[PDB]
Amino acid sequence: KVRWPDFNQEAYVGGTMVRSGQDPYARNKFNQVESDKLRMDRAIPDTRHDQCQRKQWRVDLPATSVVITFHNEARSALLRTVVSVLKKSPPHLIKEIILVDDYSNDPEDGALLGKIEKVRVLRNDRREGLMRSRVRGADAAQAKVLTFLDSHCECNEHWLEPLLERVAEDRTRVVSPIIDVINMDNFQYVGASADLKGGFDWNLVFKWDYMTPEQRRSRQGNPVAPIKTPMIAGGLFVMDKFYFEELGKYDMMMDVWGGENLEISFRVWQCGGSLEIIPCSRVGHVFRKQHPYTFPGGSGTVFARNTRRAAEVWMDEYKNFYYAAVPSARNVPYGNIQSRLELRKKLSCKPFKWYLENVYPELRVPDHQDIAFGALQQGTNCLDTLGHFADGVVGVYECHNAGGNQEWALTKEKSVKHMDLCLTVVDRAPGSLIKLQGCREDDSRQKWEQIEGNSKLRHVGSNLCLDSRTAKSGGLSVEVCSQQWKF
Amino acid sequence: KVRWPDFNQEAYVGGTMVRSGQDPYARNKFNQVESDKLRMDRAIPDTRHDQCQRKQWRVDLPATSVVITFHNEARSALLRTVVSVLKKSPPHLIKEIILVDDYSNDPEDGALLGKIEKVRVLRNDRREGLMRSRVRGADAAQAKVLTFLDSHCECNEHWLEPLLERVAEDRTRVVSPIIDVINMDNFQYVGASADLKGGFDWNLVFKWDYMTPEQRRSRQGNPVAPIKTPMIAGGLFVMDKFYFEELGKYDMMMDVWGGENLEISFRVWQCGGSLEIIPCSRVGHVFRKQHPYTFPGGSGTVFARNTRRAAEVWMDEYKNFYYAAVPSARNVPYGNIQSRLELRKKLSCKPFKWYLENVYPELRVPDHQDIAFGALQQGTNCLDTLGHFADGVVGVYECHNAGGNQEWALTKEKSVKHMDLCLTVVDRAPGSLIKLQGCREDDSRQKWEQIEGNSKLRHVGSNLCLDSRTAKSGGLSVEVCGPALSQQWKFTLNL
Amino acid sequence: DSTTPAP
Ligand SMILES: CC(=O)N[C@H]1[C@@H](OP(=O)(O)OP(=O)(O)OC[C@H]2O[C@@H](n3ccc(=O)[nH]c3=O)[C@H](O)[C@@H]2O)O[C@H](CO)[C@H](O)[C@@H]1O
Ligand SMILES: O=c1ccn([C@@H]2O[C@H](COP(=O)(O)OP(=O)(O)O)[C@@H](O)[C@H]2O)c(=O)[nH]1
Ligand SMILES: *[C@@H]1O[C@H](CO)[C@H](O)[C@H](O)[C@H]1NC(C)=O
Ligand SMILES: [Mn+2]
Ligand SMILES: [Mn+2]
């Protein structure tokens, strides 16, 4: 067994290098040549807030078993993940690093690293996917606390103590670092924002929300305080091991690449725990745009299967909003969910309505009866209030997908509305400008209907359609059926 | 004295009508022909929320004196304001209507209306402006509660009781209706949004903000509840009379028009009261784009003088953000403010910092050492994060004045930042895209400086300038400094 | 300069 600085990086990495003239993105979907140039313990900037760097961290904390699964990872990135753990963590808090080789082409990627201090390697004899691989790691873990990291991460200064501090104080907290960005093209390490929380739209894909101005203002007195989050990104977190077991580990029938972040986030919150992001903990991650590995089912199909298994167990009736966003998912078989349902009963978990009200209240819920919603698009332009209020005209600007003045709905009452204002046909004469006015179900001047395969908007009871030909010289107008609009 | 329905509207209005072929906008800056067609008590739609149309208040409410000042108002609009008050208000709650004629060309505009039940008219023998005129009205008022209205308003169903209810319960509340729109061209009455609060940017011009999603969500259980507002529009409000006196009426040295609304809003909040908008109370107002009357000498200057008198008394050091937005105001003389300062001391008012933290926290305030702040403008476009995060590119979209992804600062550390992200020169090669990264005070790749009369942004220690030529096909870039339009950038506030 | 703006 070898201390990490004595490990021969050039020998380990140097056979598997990108051959002369070959594509350096093909194997990993990140730039391997740029990854292989880096020292295994290369210096990275300290991206922590000033206050973190002055804190003296407790070290009288429970040790962790670090679980890292991988499938055909680049040797340089995997080595670097392992050494960042060993170098940046107090030695007594690392019980072991468990490498779960998820059926990589070459078993030596993992096995050669077993010589390094504290490294244990477990090889799956067939492809199992990250969820089952993580559970195999967890089952083998000797320490009281689990830490999970992707196989292309780089820990920063004092990344570990702030995470362990939280779960040592309360074992029902599941906690994550702020995840810095390691650029997939040049491998520069870049400090992420600390003002984010995790979330999702009704398609159930993970996304980052900025905190509201109100939330940020409340933290002004302690800007590095834990941030409660509705959802974790999923690959980097610390959890009490016995808590992970009692809550049901992960759903063993999810495959490859999930979905599992969604499932465990709902399960922890609904069943009495919490999720946090810990600003003083920084860990970099190679974010990429494409998967470099195979999916037997999907990737489209496996992602939908996994997501289904989460939705059908945890979301109650609100699953129907997911299917409203992704109707193709209804045709995807998802298998037996019985033991997951029995798990939910056994734990006494709160309903999803509770989760929406108490954990993710800012997620906008179409408690209906909306016919359509979102932006109203014409080419690259979008319907826009122009910041106007009642009795003002309306126009177009380039679609920005930020919502706000380009957010609209087509209601059950057949009105096209923004907030409590509605597009109003103030004058039926062709070429007349339309105006924004307070919505009244009554006002027949406010009623609109989609036509021609949801490609246009006609004013109900007329031969007038919404028309942009006047947009830059007065505003949107009503014209005899620039008339193309799609939600 | 004549009961309002017996008043001869045609005789009163006729005689001042728009003559054959003449411009119907000249006199009032709204369409007088369209205003004159209307019956004095014309029907208007009930724009109140459903819940109002049955809800209530107490059964012994104090009566009010209604004060309406005017200077050369259209007869039809003035008459209609007065009769909307008499017709839509319970008679026992109207003590009187006091018309303050602020030196109109023709004294008969006002005097003829003195025949109407409950109407008293006071004529200024010279031009005094709306602030001194309102105070003359308030000083003559007999009732416990004051109501102020502009002279071109139309009260809606049960507009008054919800306002009085609030001040009867707590005399330190100053309250307004939701102000509906009477269109200046066709005179149609249009229901306004109820999801607004009053506010302002650092130029101290009144503007309407939408409530935040959080505020709206907290009201779901009672959507017609009072709305606390940092600022009132200023022309339509109800206030306990003695409270109006104790707090110092209005600043008597403000002239003509503008921003006595600003002054009274700050004074009430800092000195222990509150401002509310009351959704069940609806009153229409003829909004116009231009003033039809004269300002001795010039509206620009008078508005700045008045605004300065408010800022210098109430805003403490934060006045410097106003002067950063409107640097020309520093050259405008504003007169003696001593008695207003002594008034502030005497009332034990909180500092402006308190007002920002507790009353208007959503007004975005520069750090004390910021060099510049706000939007970064290029023509009609603005610097925009495109919703991106760290390691993402940056771009432009059309300026929307809603802040958010178009909000930036130039810090003491010479960084251009949004939240805790900073514009970072990741590669010095001309044409290289810049990226957003976490701000690192040491990082020299994040340092920028204004040049050429604060018209461009150059990367410190280089001959590279921020450039939009690549905006739509990759993002903002760094390019050799040169005379192109794509390198022009201005912040909205400059310290 | 310019008047009180519209809601
Ligand atoms: C930074 C971050 O939060 N990343 C998460 C993101 O995926 P990513 O988008 O980061 O996907 P990824 O391929 O990096 O994540 C997979 C991780 O598990 C390994 N792996 C993957 C497939 C497989 O069949 N066997 C295997 O061992 C893989 O080598 C890597 O270490 O969202 C996922 C939801 O499913 C995971 O929760 C990831 O951790
Ligand atoms: O020197 C003046 C200027 C204005 N006013 C009155 O003050 C009210 C508010 O003025 P205006 O309606 O011009 O302002 P806006 O509501 O458009 O901001 C109106 O009743 C005006 O006639 C007045 O009595 N004297
Ligand atoms: C707009 O503000 C001015 C400031 O002088 C006046 O208070 C005017 O009465 C206001 N208009 C409304 C509708 O409140
Ligand atoms: Mn990953
Ligand atoms: Mn007015």
Side-chain angles (χ1 to χ4, degrees), chain A residues 183 191 193-194 397 400 419-420, chain B residues 183 193-194 216 391 397-398 420 438:
Chain A
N183 180 281
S193 171
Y397 278 139
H400 57 214
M419 305 290 185
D420 65 343
Chain B
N183 181 278
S193 171
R216 295 196 304 190
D391 201 42
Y397 278 135
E398 299 102 292
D420 63 346

Side-chain angles (χ1 to χ4, degrees), chain B residues 73 150-153 235-236 257 285-288, chain C residues 4:
Chain B
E73 183 58 82
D150 281 11
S151 54
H152 35 258
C153 293
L236 322 228
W257 174 97
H285 172 255
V286 183
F287 290 92
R288 55 191 167 198
Chain C
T4 286

Side-chain angles (χ1 to χ4, degrees), chain B residues 130-131 134 150 179 233-236 257-261 285 287, chain C residues 3-4:
Chain B
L130 68 82
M131 322 63 201
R134 281 188 198 153
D150 281 11
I179 303 171
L236 322 228
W257 174 97
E260 92 294 342
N261 61 158
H285 172 255
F287 290 92
Chain C
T3 49
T4 286

Side-chain angles (χ1 to χ4, degrees), chain A residues 80-94:
Chain A
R80 201 155 53 239
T81 300
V82 170
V83 341
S84 79
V85 173
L86 294 168
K87 179 176 169 179
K88 303 293 179 85
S89 311
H92 74 277
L93 299 175
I94 304 301

Side-chain angles (χ1 to χ4, degrees), chain B residues 68-73 100-102 124 127-131 133-134 149-152 233 235-236 255-257 285-295, chain C residues 2-5:
Chain B
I68 297 170
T69 87
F70 63 101
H71 174 78
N72 293 328
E73 183 58 82
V100 188
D101 173 4
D102 187 17
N124 292 150
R127 183 79 175 280
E128 295 290 356
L130 68 82
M131 322 63 201
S133 300
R134 281 188 198 153
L149 299 178
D150 281 11
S151 54
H152 35 258
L236 322 228
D255 296 322
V256 188
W257 174 97
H285 172 255
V286 183
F287 290 92
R288 55 191 167 198
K289 313 272 207 296
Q290 302 176 104
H291 306 281
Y293 45 72
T294 63
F295 283 74
Chain C
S2 181
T3 49
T4 286

Side-chain angles (χ1 to χ4, degrees), chain A residues 73 150-153 235-236 257 285-288:
Chain A
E73 183 58 81
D150 281 10
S151 54
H152 37 260
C153 293
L236 322 228
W257 175 97
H285 172 252
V286 182
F287 290 91
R288 55 191 167 198

Side-chain angles (χ1 to χ4, degrees), chain A residues 161-202:
Chain A
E161 301 94 315
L163 303 177
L164 295 173
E165 200 169 61
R166 301 296 298 164
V167 319
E169 176 177 54
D170 182 340
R171 67 191 233 95
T172 66
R173 302 159 179 166
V174 179
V175 306
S176 2
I178 282 170
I179 303 170
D180 291 334
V181 180
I182 300 168
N183 180 281
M184 58 167 285
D185 296 306
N186 53 53
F187 267 75
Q188 287 164 213
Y189 186 111
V190 173
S193 171
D195 293 341
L196 303 176
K197 314 179 291 156
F200 57 92
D201 289 324
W202 285 111

